[PDB]
Ligand binder design. Structure first.
Ligand code: SYJ
Lengths: 300, 254
């Protein structure tokens, strides 16, 4: 079980770890998060009590290095940093643990929620969407724009999600205009799956990462990417059975996890109505359709 | 964005544009079968592609063979329209290609956009104008060429005849829309008005009669009165009560 120690908590802040969160008071003796499950990516995220615009976080995997958080009073945020000195780090963690100044990652043993949300998400794929090659962890915030949003302004601070555009040459083969526009199977299977993602696992990993960035940071471009990737599958007449069954599981856990109160901003009426009721795959997402109908019937 | 009353003069500027109307592409007669079911029989249709500035009409005849063994024909008709418009643009020299295509029906926007991805600088636009281009098939010579076609065929017309020798494209377009609006509301009466003097003939190379400027003013009057008469007969409204502000507004409104 890995640990992300904090140097200190000089400013009052809501700290998130994956789907959990807790309030820390200005100069509270908080020295970090222990018992973090190995085997998955994690996201530690922040919302300053004095300024809710300040909403940001770090994707990391504790198998890749020893990471800690330290407040930077100049840039005015909690920064992730890597500790290179193994022995210094082990000794820091041991002290804070002995003094019980660490919150425990509060995983219920029955609870597969985080695994279910991150099943296909891999740090190496995150690091290609979020380019900052000197760090092993990835910074995301509420205001970072996607490469696609920037085409329609700082390239270095962008989310490099795969551009999906239903009305692009990429999506539409010359001479198959109506066929490719009405049945996106070519775009899904040849361009995206075989061509760009190489397999359904990478496609689902980006889909899951987009959802999580949408939910944890209210990142609008991430929400757009998550909906495009769902719509591209639901608008394809020809999808491998395993992908449809897996999509239903993926979406079910995403809808299950979404805060009830954020449904209005994070869910696109047109895409969900189309995907559940109109699309080729309208009868292929039983779990997702049941949770959406029971949780969010107004949207539909 | 959308073409409306506000930006109407833009039709007559020197940026090449085409209207595309797909109403007469997919045409059927509905009939009873022997077993008492209903069936359709397709007839020849046409794409109505018009340069509102020049009067140049690219009448692409849609032969019933297009539809053979195809499903969801009203949907296919949009995509076939978009294919034929894109093939027309591609066939034109670069300096004759339109900068804008205005579709008369919003269901044409996606089909045309997807067929024109090779032309990202051609703006595909809807219009808020209620244009009477469906009545194109009430112009005898246009109806005849469509009905006689035995294969796909493009036929080129000037829908303004020689009017641009005497009037502006603004006035030519208003005259054309008033004629088509009349033909659409009461074809019989509209045509009777256009032939009421057998001395004024239609030249072999024209669609409309050779009216003098004075006769055009009279004809335009009779067309407006017909649109008003029919609007009266439709809504059970006493038209002899109406004002000139009330009146103008129901050809406008229409
Ligand atoms: O329908 S036409 O082809 N053109 C419009 C029209 C109607 C009456 C006069 O012009 C036509 C009909 C009847 C006699 C000659 C024609 F040119």
């Amino acid at each position: 079980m890995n640990t992300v120690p904090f140097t200190s908590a000089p400013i009052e802040v809501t700290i998130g770890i994956d789907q959990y969160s807790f309030n820390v008071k200005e100069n509270q003796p908080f020295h970090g998060i222990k018992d973090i499950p190995i085997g998955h990516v994690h996201v530690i995220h922040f919302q300053h009590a004095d300024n809710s615009s300040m909403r940001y976080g770090y994707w990391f995997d504790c198998r890749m290095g020893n990471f800690y958080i330290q407040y930077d009073p100049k840039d005015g945020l909690y920064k992730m940093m890597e500790e290179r000195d193994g022995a210094k780090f082990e000794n820091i963690v041991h002290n804070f643990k002995e003094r019980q100044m660490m919150v425990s990652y509060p995983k219920i043993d029955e609870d597969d929620t985080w695994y279910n949300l991150t099943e296909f998400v891999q740090m190496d794929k995150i690091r290609k969407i979020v380019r900052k090659d000197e760090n092993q962890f990835s910074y995301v915030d509420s205001s970072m724009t996607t490469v696609q949003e920037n085409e329609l302004s700082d390239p270095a601070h962008s989310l490099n999600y795969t551009v999906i555009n239903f009305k692009s040459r990429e999506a539409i083969r010359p001479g198959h205009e109506m066929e490719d526009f009405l049945d996106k199977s070519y775009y899904l299977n040849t361009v995206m799956l075989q061509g760009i993602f190489k397999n359904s696992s990478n496609y689902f990993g980006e889909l899951q990462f987009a959802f999580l960035n949408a939910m944890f940071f209210g990142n609008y471009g991430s929400s757009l990417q998550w909906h495009a990737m769902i719509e591209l599958i639901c608008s394809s007449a020809t999808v491998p059975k395993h992908m449809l069954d897996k999509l239903d599981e993926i979406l079910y856990y995403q809808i299950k996890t979404l805060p009830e109160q954020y449904s209005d901003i994070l869910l696109n009426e047109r895409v969900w109505n189309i995907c559940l009721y109109s699309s080729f795959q309208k009868n292929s997402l039983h779990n997702t359709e049941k949770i959406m109908e029971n949780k969010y019937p107004e949207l539909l | 964005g959308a073409m409306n009353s506000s930006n109407y003069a833009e039709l007559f500027n020197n940026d090449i544009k085409l209207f595309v109307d797909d109403t007469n592409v997919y045409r059927v007669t509905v009939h009873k079968t022997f077993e008492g079911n209903v069936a359709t029989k397709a007839i020849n249709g046409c794409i109505f592609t018009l340069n509102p500035k020049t009067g140049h009409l690219f009448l692409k005849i849609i032969h019933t063979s297009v539809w053979a063994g195809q499903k969801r024909l009203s949907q296919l008709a949009k995509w076939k329209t978009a294919e034929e418009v894109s093939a027309l643009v591609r066939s034109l020299p670069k300096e004759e290609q339109p900068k804008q295509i205005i579709v008369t029906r919003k269901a044409m926007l996606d089909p045309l956009e997807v067929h024109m991805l090779d032309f990202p600088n051609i703006a595909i636009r809807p219009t808020e104008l209620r244009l009477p281009f469906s009545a194109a098939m009430s112009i005898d010579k246009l109806s005849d060429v469509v009905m006689k076609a035995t294969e796909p065929q493009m036929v080129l017309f000037n829908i303004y005849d020689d009017w641009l020798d005497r009037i502006s494209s603004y006035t030519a377009f208003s005259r054309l829309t008033l004629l088509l609006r009349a033909l659409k509301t009461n074809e019989e009466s509209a045509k009777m008005i256009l032939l009421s003097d057998p001395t004024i003939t239609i030249k072999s190379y024209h669609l409309w009669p050779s009216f003098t400027d004075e006769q055009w003013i009279t004809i335009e009057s009779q067309m407006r009165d017909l649109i008003l008469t029919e609007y009266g007969r439709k809504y059970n409204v006493n038209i002899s009560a109406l004002t000139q502000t009330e009146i103008k507004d129901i050809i406008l409104g229409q």
